[PDB]
């Protein structure tokens, strides 16, 4: 039993809710919140900009030190950093950005990072400003992630389309 509330169950291990991931993180304090990161951990907009804003820029400060030490992530890769006031940990995962021409097949590799964590609160990778089809992203999530994932979808209209079209 966990504290996630109001989710629709899609499969054995995948759950979905129309929610603001920032507000959901603030209420649940999950062990892991996933950020929709880029390779530079520059949290300017989308989910990343919202999560970072909610940490009063502490996420960005920590991220800049991470990059200065380690260099950029790989597309499809991830790193574990602090969850600050939102979660114990933040798993920064880099899905391909279609608006940069990155290979959508890397989306499966990106979701594989979730399997290193038993339970996660997450957005749909490569959705939103990353330019992928969120319905495709949901399909790859369900077919790749085996651990327990709670998907927060900000847009109510999109949430309804994802549920209604789910196979
Ligand atoms: C601009 C832009 N382009 O894409 C997106 C996107 C993609 C996936 N999930 C989200 C999302 C999901 C749940 N809560 C959220 N709070 C703030 C963002 C967010 C946003 N934003």
UniProtKB/Swiss-Prot annotation:
Q: What does it catalyze?
A: Thiol-dependent hydrolysis of ester, thioester, amide, peptide and isopeptide bonds formed by the C-terminal Gly of ubiquitin (a 76-residue protein attached to proteins as an intracellular targeting signal)
Annotated compartments: Host endoplasmic reticulum membrane
Q: What does this protein do?
A: Responsible for the cleavages located at the N-terminus of the replicase polyprotein. Participates together with nsp4 in the assembly of virally-induced cytoplasmic double-membrane vesicles necessary for viral replication. Antagonizes innate immune induction of type I interferon by blocking the phosphorylation, dimerization and subsequent nuclear translocation of host IRF3. Also prevents host NF-kappa-B signaling. In addition, PL-PRO possesses a deubiquitinating/deISGylating activity and processes both 'Lys-48'- and 'Lys-63'-linked polyubiquitin chains from cellular substrates.
Q: What name appears for this protein in its UniProt entry?
A: Papain-like protease nsp3
Q: How is its activity regulated?
A: Inhibited in vitro by GRL-0617.
The taxonomy runs:
Viruses, Riboviria, Orthornavirae, Pisuviricota, Pisoniviricetes
Domain Macro, by residue range, is: 1-167
Source gene?
A: rep
Which source organism?
Severe acute respiratory syndrome coronavirus 2
Subunit notes for this chain? Answer: May form homohexamers. Interacts with N protein.
Membrane association type: Multi-pass membrane protein
